[PDB]
Write a protein that binds this ligand. Structure first.
Ligand code: HEM
Ligand code: HEM
Ligand code: HEM
Ligand code: HEM
Lengths: 146, 140, 146, 140
């Protein structure tokens, strides 16, 4: 609902170091590899046969940057993610029919990617802050399912 | 159902954990308690502060059980038998909580094994932790 | 978010036939039997060793009537369940630390109980209406976790 | 993990289903499509209206596979082998959706078997449907 100032601090400080272009491709890629049924929504992307294929797929990194773009955008508007993600909520819910559990998995994958990238800097309180964020984004995206 | 590749990936990644096994277990627990506060109510007699000797000791136990599971990946139900009974009967741990701890274990592994934590290995570890979770929730 | 008039019609018509006192004991009982970890929140209730023990347990039926009471109350206020369940949300979330997934399971158990009781009258559109209701109640109860 | 009691309960309850097996399968599907509209996108080439011959035909297939599972409850992975491949590889069915269909099958059984659907049998059927779901999602 609300991040504490220390949580906000943790989120923004870390995100200023995030390569938006890259972390996006990585999280989407890992989603498709780790949770293979999610590939069903990206039949157009071409080769997704192997993990290397998926990660190296131009269409996957391109769209992952789009996705994370919306996320990076979501952080500058943490007060009301509901209104912020409305266009995307209708899209994902009414048109794509993505089950909202997948929003939760993607957020957790993103957390894994941040941990991978930042190592020791991605401390447990820093993680806890990002878990509130990814849950908020997930819930905002799921609002049109309710 | 773990593939031959999954078992290879899991054995390799966990093999790189080495003498840190205990330490990483403790960190996964702390990550879980801080990110998912509802889990704390299972340890009302632990001090859950950072550096708690009780969390450290318990993390080593959790890590040791994971190692037993890796070492006997082809018959985890047998290997984790007593633990399945403990978590379901005695403790009555909500199955949701195994997903939370599993996620925090992946995060810990990701944070400590830059090289090993590839997408393929990530997938393998996730399935492994899910199978472990299945066994530990199997006696309800 | 909003039931259609036909859904409202389905809900209210069926609920007017519900024995509030009885359906409550039954759903709670079945929750405890079907999802045994939920017993952890009711250590005070005494004997819960067997299904017959659980269903026949006075404390379980007593509290099940309480629970369903709040539910029966929840139906006369379907516009804003959030405000309606606030006291219960803080209780279940801040004090009892029930994982919200359990709210979802209880609602589904309730649906099974209604189906059992009403048989053919519990048609698929009637069920669909109640699924929106039990999801709304579940989400309202979970709001304090966000 | 199904207990001896679970298998007895499942065999008994499903045995009472008889010639309605097909019909109940079709109804569970309709209940799922109406309660959980996201599932409909797996059947874009079905007419999903009430009384649809395609839903009826498909429900019989779903019921038959459940019967195969009941008949071979001690080795469901083997028995449901081809179906596991179909749902994971070919169709890529989201594991969440198996919980939805499983719930709607319980509701259908509840609605048609007043006598059989005791709390104990309910628990047994739920675990059975979860094990079936585990097998069908096992090849991801
Ligand atoms: C959870 C956080 C997510 C965010 C922030 C997000 C964001 C976005 C954005 C910004 C777009 C581009 C929309 C546009 O072109 O205007 C998009 C499209 C899309 N998303 Fe996501 N997404 C998320 C999760 C998911 C998941 C989990 C899936 C599938 C499993 C998914 C499937 C798709 C697909 C198939 C498109 C292409 C639709 C189109 O452009 O026609 N998304 N998403
Ligand atoms: C990978 C999953 C898990 C593994 C391998 C695991 C392992 C273990 C082990 C080995 C013990 C025995 C400790 C001892 O004998 O001293 C134990 C006990 C215990 N576990 Fe777990 N566990 C897991 C998941 C969970 C979860 C998710 C929870 C709750 C959120 C939980 C709560 C407990 C509690 C409360 C005890 C008793 C601690 C005490 O009273 O000292 N476990 N677990
Ligand atoms: C999902 C719909 C639910 C509703 C509408 C509901 C409603 C209620 C109500 C009305 C009370 C009495 C509060 C009071 O005395 O003022 C209560 C108490 C309680 N609930 Fe629930 N409940 C739900 C789900 C659950 C679940 C799933 C669990 C556990 C798995 C649970 C555990 C408890 C416990 C342990 C109490 C006793 C707390 C006390 O009175 O001190 N509830 N609930
Ligand atoms: C108890 C769980 C399930 C069982 C026993 C089951 C059974 C079956 C069977 C036997 C077939 C083959 C039909 C044929 O060969 O003609 C099939 C196909 C199929 N299943 Fe399932 N299924 C289950 C869950 C699901 C779920 C949850 C979904 C999606 C929401 C799903 C979607 C499909 C689709 C789209 C087909 C192909 C239908 C066609 O193209 O004609 N299944 N399933």
């Amino acid at each position: 609902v609300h991040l504490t100032p220390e949580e906000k601090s943790a989120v923004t400080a870390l995100w200023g170091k995030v390569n938006v272009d890259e972390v996006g491709g990585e999280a989407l890629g890992r989603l498709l590899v780790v949770y293979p049924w999610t590939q069903r929504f990206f039949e157009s992307f071409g080769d997704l046969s192997t993990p290397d294929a998926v990660m190296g797929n131009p269409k996957v990194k391109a769209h992952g940057k789009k996705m994370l773009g919306a996320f990076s955008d979501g952080l500058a508007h943490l007060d009301n993610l509901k209104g912020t993600f409305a266009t995307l909520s209708e899209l994902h819910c009414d048109k794509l029919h993505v089950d909202p559990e997948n929003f939760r998995l993607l957020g957790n994958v993103l957390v894994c990617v941040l941990a991978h990238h930042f190592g020791k800097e991605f401390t447990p309180p820093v993680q806890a802050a990002y878990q509130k964020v990814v849950a908020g984004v997930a819930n905002a995206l799921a609002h049109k399912y309710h | 159902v773990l593939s031959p590749a999954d078992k290879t990936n899991v054995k390799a990644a966990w093999g790189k954990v080495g003498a840190h096994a205990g330490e990483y277990g403790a960190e996964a627990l702390e990550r879980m308690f801080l990110s998912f506060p509802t889990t704390k109510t299972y340890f009302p007699h632990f001090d859950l502060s950072h550096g708690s000797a009780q969390v450290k000791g318990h993390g080593k136990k959790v890590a040791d059980a994971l190692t037993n599971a890796v070492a006997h990946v082809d018959d985890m139900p047998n290997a984790l038998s007593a633990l399945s009974d403990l978590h379901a009967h005695k403790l009555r741990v909500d199955p949701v909580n195994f997903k939370l701890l599993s996620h925090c274990l992946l995060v810990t592994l990701a944070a400590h094994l830059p090289a090993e934590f590839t997408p393929a290995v990530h997938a393998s570890l996730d399935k492994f932790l899910a199978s472990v979770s299945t066994v530990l929730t199997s006696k309800y």
